[PDB]
């Protein structure tokens, strides 16, 4: 079985517990080639074993205490039409993310 020139890999994202921020983050296994929608689906499956839907939530990439950016399937960074993935944004393994209600 052949590996890509630009390889696909699993990553763990540390998702903030929505009920209480100071609680440990929840690890969620995802693929770097996952679209932002697929990432949200995986977080919702893991964090909600009345569920929110992928389209009801924004994925937030967090840095330190306050800094955060919203990642989406399509935005000003999209190259015209591939859906944006984690590798598009270069989200690193073990990055802190959050799901925030739109």
């Amino acid at each position: 079985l052949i590996r890509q020139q630009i390889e696909y890999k699993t990553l763990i994202l540390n998702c903030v517990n929505p009920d209480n921020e100071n609680s440990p983050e929840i690890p969620v296994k995802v693929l770097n080639c996952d679209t932002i929608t697929q990432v949200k689906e995986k977080i919702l499956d893991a964090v909600y074993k009345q569920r929110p839907r992928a389209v009801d939530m924004d994925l937030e990439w967090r840095q330190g205490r306050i800094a955060r950016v919203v990642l989406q399937d399509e935005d000003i960074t999209t190259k015209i039409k591939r859906l944006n993935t984690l590798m598009h944004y270069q989200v690193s393994d073990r990055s802190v993310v959050a799901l925030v209600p739109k």
Binding site: Q63, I66, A67, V69, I76, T77, H88, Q90, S92
Partner: protein
Amino acid sequence: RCKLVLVGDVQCGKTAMLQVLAKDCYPETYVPTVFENYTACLETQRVELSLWDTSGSPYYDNVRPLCYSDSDAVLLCFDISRPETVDSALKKWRTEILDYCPSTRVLLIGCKTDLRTDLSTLMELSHQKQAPISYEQGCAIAKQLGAEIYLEGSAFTSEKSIHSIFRTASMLCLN
């Protein structure tokens, strides 16, 4: 409340400035940024500054533009000891600003002015057929770009020089 986003080449001195301004702390060791936000306050009129630090790396070309949103100014930074960073300013950074926030005011910011008197930096530039960017050159580059002002300082040697950059930046945004 004023939102400023800092952009410019890797190692040009953006994070060093924000750490000195917001944290009273200078980073001798280079830690590559992804993105970050600082909060500072100063008087010109009390002003609260939300300062966005971005990676200068092409690696993060897809996430950095998400930081430009609703910014009152972009601080386009370069390293006065490395003229290649002025080339990037006139080319990569001008083009990116024009692609993502063309109507946003731009301030041209020189970093590491202390290296103008650093013997080993001077010797290296001479062996490369280069020289440090001067203040007069910064002003000219700002004119060429359409930047509203050229300001410079030294995070390494002058905490007050960084304060004065942001005081001036805050005043330009309020007027």
